[PDB]
Amino acid sequence: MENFVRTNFNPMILERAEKTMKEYGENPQNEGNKFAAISTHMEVCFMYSDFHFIDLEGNTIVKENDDDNAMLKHRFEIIEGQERNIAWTIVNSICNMTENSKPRFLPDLYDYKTNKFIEIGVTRRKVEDYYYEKASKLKGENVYIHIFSFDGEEMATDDEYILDEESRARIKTRLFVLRQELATAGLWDSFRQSEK
Ligand SMILES: [Mn+2]
Numbered sequence: 001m002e003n004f005v006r007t008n009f010n011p012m013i014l015e016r017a018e019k020t021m022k023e024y025g026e027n028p029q030n031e032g033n034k035f036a037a038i039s040t041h042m043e044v045c046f047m048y049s050d051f052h053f054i055d056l057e058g059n060t061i062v063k064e065n066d067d068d069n070a071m072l073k074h075r076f077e078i079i080e081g082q083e084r085n086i087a088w089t090i091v092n093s094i095c096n097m098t099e100n101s102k103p104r105f106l107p108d109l110y111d112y113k114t115n116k117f118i119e120i121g122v123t124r125r126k127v128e129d130y131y132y133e134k135a136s137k138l139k140g141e142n143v144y145i146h147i148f149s150f151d152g153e154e155m156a157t158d159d160e161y162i163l164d165e166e167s168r169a170r171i172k173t174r175l176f177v178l179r180q181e182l183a184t185a186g187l188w189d190s191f192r193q194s195e196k
Contacts, residue, residue: 001032001187008181009039016042016081033194040122040178042081044148045108047171048120048163049076060113062164077110080120091117103141114162117143122175124192127153148172150179150192 005028006014017038021027028035051062052075060075068074077094079087087106094110095102100117109118119138123130127149134145135157144162147155152172161168182188 002028004185004187005035005039013039013042033191044122044171045080045120049078052076054113075113079106080108107143119143119145121147123149124195127155131155148175150175152176
């Protein structure tokens with residue numbers, strides 16, 4: 001619900017979520033649940049990406065300060081939460097500099113280290129169900145798929161995790177916290193059900 005969302009997410013995320021929402025006619029007002037889902041999905045994207053860089057030796061490394069700067073490239077291109085115009089510019093550009101084929105759907109992320117596109121999903125349902133729902137909708141176009149849930153379970157393509165364990169932890173907790181908060185605010189049930 002809108003008050004809950006506006007209370008529990010930072011302004012950057014709220015800005016982006018509201019934005020992407022003002023494109024299907026829906027508004028946090030009569031669509032609290034969608035607003036929540038988008039907020040969550042977005043936050044997870046940032047959590048996946050922030051503080052992640054690539055070395056001058058090409059290794060991946062996590063750094064608390066976050067600022068880029070010429071010895072450190074950002075590990076990921078955050079595609080989710082940009083304007084579709086910019087998103088596609090980024091996707092198209094990347095496919096240009098490589099042998100990636102332009103994907104049918106916009107991905108959540110791009111990893112410069114593995115040269116993969118990344119779809120991210122968060123679910124209130126199982127994790128298997130969502131994964132196979134996504135995998136199969138995304139068949140062929142090798143995009144790496146990472147699913148999280150609110151019960152702290154998790155499921156990636158072929159079960160390898162290019163994200164460090166700490167960051168995956170951090171995520172799984174956050175989703176957990178959120179689940180509690182929702183429950184104590186009496187919103188968890190309605191939300192859990194509203195999915196699909
Ligand atoms: Mn997604």
